[PDB]
Amino acid sequence: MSLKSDEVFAKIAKRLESIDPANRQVEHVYKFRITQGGKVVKNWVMDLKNVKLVESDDAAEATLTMEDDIMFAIGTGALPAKEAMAQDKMEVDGQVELIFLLEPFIASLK
């Protein structure tokens, strides 16, 4: 009934409220896919227009699908999203240029 990834999304959201217009460069919508054990069980959507996280199936500039245990690692600055993708522990769709543009942004907002 509850996923660990929720913890990361919750904290990430509260952090998005600290974002300021002074520092900018790029911002787009990102969809996250939460799988249970090894199969998709839910899909979350990141609202960049309102700066809030919500649950929807709407399209997005990119999609990041990874196991709950994996998403947590990339959320708690545990394991690098890059390496995880190398071991096939996670995948991403859409603009590979933007998806990676978030890696170095994990410090400002994951």
From TrEMBL:
It holds the Pfam family SCP2. This is Sterol carrier protein 2. It comes from the Eukaryota. PANTHER family: EUCALYPTUS, ISOFORM B, STEROL CARRIER PROTEIN 2 SCP-2 FAMILY PROTEIN. Residues 13-99 form the SCP2 domain. GO terms for cellular component: cytosol. The gene is SCP-2.
